[PDB]
Design a protein around this nucleic acid. Structure first.
Lengths: 233, 56, 252, 121
RNA sequence: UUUACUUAUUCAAUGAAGCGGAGCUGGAAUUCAUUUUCCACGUUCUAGCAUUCAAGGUCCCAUUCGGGGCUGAUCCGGGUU
RNA sequence: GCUUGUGACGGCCCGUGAAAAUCCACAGGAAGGAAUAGUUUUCAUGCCAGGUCGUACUGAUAACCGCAGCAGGUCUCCAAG
RNA sequence: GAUGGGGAAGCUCCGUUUCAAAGGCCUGAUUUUAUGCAGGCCACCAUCGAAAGGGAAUCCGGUUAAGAUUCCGGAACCUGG
């Protein structure tokens, strides 16, 4: 409506040098990026066995939230309160002279792979969380089989980093409750019911099932045009 | 020689048209003529295409 | 014995090509979006001599679709193209001399040159003076195209393989008697050190298998196996026939 | 759940922080003194008869000079020591490996007075 | 023995820019439930020019020297081809 | 006239007879800018500085190589009647 | 002929733009901003290699036992600031 004018650009072939478009699909990424992406792809494409891919069936987010609430109640000690209780115990050994009777029993969460495996073997663990992570997967593939052989409820949860956050490390790869105060036993039992429904009770069919065999979107479309309209329409 | 064009002023290195010390005057004339006439025939192609396509 | 001429050519110290005055490599434009969905227009600016090459070259100038600049390309000139001519390259380009089309888009009987073996190599076949391939059929299923090459061989190429329309210029070159050793000298001092050629029969036995003798003779069959090895391959290699060619060859 | 937008198809190094030097110990204990000061720059006058002729005539002093020295340094040293303004310095390397400087003073100063002040003639 | 798959391996190209699928919009076509499909989906008388997150349109902030988003330039998948 | 440079031309080639640093111009229209003084440091003048190394001589029937002050060999410029 | 990478028991070889996340030019920000930050620009990617190839700019007269387009006198030019 002013003097100002419209000059539309014809961004067709053979005229009007093209505009800046999003080219994230065509960038020459670095080699570590391509390694990890193609590693994801390849592990998806190949027929994975059953004992791997008994992972990939991690725990739902609501159940996981409840689980991590329960565990974050029974977080471990840190250096600050450890030094606090060390002071308390150095005092009590002087005044009370009561060794291993000043501080109460801790009900912390048990972590560490060798520790937790030994606990599972001696049947002292009441609930075991396992990471869908680790890359040296041999560290953790044998744990469902153990928990099943020994009668322990196990759950494959997402995040060794979650486990590390609750247990005051970066990564843990496992976590376990053996002892629990007489206030959360009912919650723990509810969790065990859900978890055994999802993981331990499905263990036979999961042991039978073979994973992977997935195709790319391009190849899947090629299949869905090839095998579709051989007799479809 | 090339680095003397830096010593010398600009009236020595350019004439007062568009494309002064770069193109000949007759070359400039040709490209002006060409520009104007092709930009007219562009309009003509547009309206011919419109009158043809809008027939149906 | 001693290492022979044909052996040490491969080390190629003084047998490298002489490439100073060559204007560049004759390459088709990179196969990109325009050239595989539409056409792109270019201008022939120069038609220029290329040393060590009887065929002339065309300096064609195109626009870059993605950045404001002019990208220049070096085509082999088809016979008939001229300065100030527009060159159209792509899938939807018209059938005119100098244009770069896919061999599926062209029809049968079409005469092309600088034609890709497989898409993207930017020209491999029918590139020397006077040469062309003929298209002699399409197989539109599996997008192939059967063609006659200047040797007489039939080949099957992708329909997406591009080819420039017409015959390459410089034809008639080998009709003229070169007529003197100096002209052969000047020919080859712009190509490589392949000239003059001495005969094995004329040299000593260390220097060649045909060498030696109280007469100039070979002594053994000059036809030598494909399974011979380097130093033993200095005649007619894997010769399935020999002698004056009589009658119809290209038997099929 | 959002993605970056990249107009180029090229990935280059992120220009991360270039942090500076902050050493816990010096690279060497003590700074070296000036390696080429004035008394190292001028070694000896040159009292050949040609040089004395040039003193009398051209207002030119002739000095033996360090091979590591240049014209800037020679001018600076002469002005510093003999309290003299300086025009053109010429230099050569002799066939014995020492440097020879022909220092031309300005018209105000008299190289012969400067020379008999230096002590030689 | 033959055949099929892509991911291993191999070849080639590129400043790893426009792949695959599905859609809007035109044409033919059969339509029998409104489809069943297919082709195109901005440049060809001229040795011209084509560039500065594109003008325009619209919504914000604020319009005070202005700045931002979307659309213009279809969506999804990020498998460079 | 001789030597040399240069120009415009002609002939020859299946031979058509280097590159890069470097300098300029053009296109473009970013940005900035009017008089109570602002832009021009491609006009004129004026100010300062210009480092390092080489530099003598022979260059050949005695200054090089040839065991040597060897009738040998060893690249080029100028060029009188 | 390095680098990146790859070969080779290894001394080392290939290769010089390559299967590499191989950098800088400016702008604003400004009087916390040192040079970061809001931005936009670019793509190529060592180095060596010619006192006869390319190349910023000097001439005269005089002067020494022996130096001179280098010194003296006079008259100029280029580059950088």
């Amino acid at each position: 409506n002013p003097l100002t004018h419209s000059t539309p650009k014809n961004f067709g072939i053979g005229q009007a040098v093209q505009p800046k478009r999003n080219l994230s699909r065509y960038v020459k990424w670095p080699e570590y990026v391509r390694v990890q992406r193609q590693k994801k792809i390849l592990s998806i494409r190949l027929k994975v066995p059953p004992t791997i891919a008994q992972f990939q069936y991690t725990l739902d987010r609501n159940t996981a939230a409840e689980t991590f609430k329960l565990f974050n109640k029974y977080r471990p000690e840190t250096a600050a309160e450890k030094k606090e209780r060390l002071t308390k115990e150095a005092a009590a050994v002087a005044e009370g002279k009561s060794k291993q009777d000043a501080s109460p029993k801790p009900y912390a969460v048990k972590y560490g792979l060798n520790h937790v495996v030994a606990l599972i073997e001696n049947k002292k663990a009441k609930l075991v969380l396992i990471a869908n992570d680790v890359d040296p997967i041999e560290l953790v593939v044998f744990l469902p089989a153990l928990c099943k052989k020994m009668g322990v409820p196990y759950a494959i949860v997402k995040g060794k980093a979650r486990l590390g956050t609750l247990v005051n490390q970066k990564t843990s790869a496992v976590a376990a409750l053996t002892e629990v105060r007489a206030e959360d036993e009912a919650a723990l039992a509810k969790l065990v019911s859900t978890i055994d429904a999802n993981f331990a009770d499905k263990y036979d069919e999961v042991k039978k099932h073979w994973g992977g065999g997935i195709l790319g979107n391009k190849a899947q479309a090629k299949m869905d045009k090839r095998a579709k309209n051989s007799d479809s329409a | 020689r090339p680095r003397q064009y830096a010593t010398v002023s600009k009236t020595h290195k350019t004439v007062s048209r568009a494309y002064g010390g770069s193109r000949c005057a007759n070359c400039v004339k040709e490209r002006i003529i060409r520009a104007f006439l092709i930009e007219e025939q562009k309009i003509v192609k547009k309206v011919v295409k419109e009158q043809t396509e809008a027939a149906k | 014995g001693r290492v022979i001429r044909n052996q040490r050519k491969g080390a190629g110290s003084i047998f490298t090509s002489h490439t100073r005055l060559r204007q560049g490599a004759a390459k088709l434009r990179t196969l990109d979006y325009a050239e595989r969905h539409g056409y792109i227009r270019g201008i022939v600016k120069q038609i220029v001599h290329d040393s060590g090459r009887g065929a002339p070259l065309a300096k064609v100038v195109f626009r870059d679709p993605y950045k404001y600049r002019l990208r220049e390309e070096i085509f082999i000139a088809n016979e008939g193209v001229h300065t100030g001519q527009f060159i159209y390259a792509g899938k939807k380009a018209s059938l005119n001399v100098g244009n770069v089309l896919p061999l599926g888009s062209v029809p049968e009987g079409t005469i092309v040159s600088n034609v890709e073996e497989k898409p993207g190599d930017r020209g491999a076949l029918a590139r020397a003076s006077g040469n062309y391939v003929i298209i002699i059929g399409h197989n539109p299923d599996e997008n192939k195209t059967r063609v006659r090459l200047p040797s007489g061989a039939k080949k099957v190429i992708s329909s997406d393989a591009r080819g420039v329309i017409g015959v390459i210029a410089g034809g008639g070159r080998v009709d003229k008697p070169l007529l003197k050793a100096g002209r052969a000298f000047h020919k080859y001092r712009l190509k490589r050190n392949s000239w003059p050629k001495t005969r094995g029969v004329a040299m000593n036995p260390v220097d060649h298998p045909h060498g030696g003798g109280n007469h100039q003779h070979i002594g053994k069959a000059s036809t030598i196996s494909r399974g011979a090895v380097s130093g033993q391959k200095a005649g007619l290699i894997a010769a399935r026939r020999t002698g004056l060619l009589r009658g119809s060859q290209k038997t099929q | 759940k959002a993605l970056k937008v990249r107009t180029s198809a090229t990935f280059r190094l992120p220009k991360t922080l270039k942090l500076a030097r902050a050493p816990k110990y010096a690279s060497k204990a003590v700074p070296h003194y000036n390696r080429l000061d004035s008394y190292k720059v001028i070694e000896q006058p040159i009292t050949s008869e040609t040089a004395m002729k040039k003193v009398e005539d051209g207002n030119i002093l002739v000095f033996q000079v360090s091979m590591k020295a240049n014209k800037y340094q020679i001018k600076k040293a002469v002005k510093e020591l003999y309290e003299v303004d300086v025009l053109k310095v010429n230099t050569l390397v002799r066939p014995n490996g020492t440097k020879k400087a022909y220092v031309r003073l300005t018209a105000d100063y008299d190289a012969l007075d400067i020379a008999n002040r230096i002590g030689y003639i």
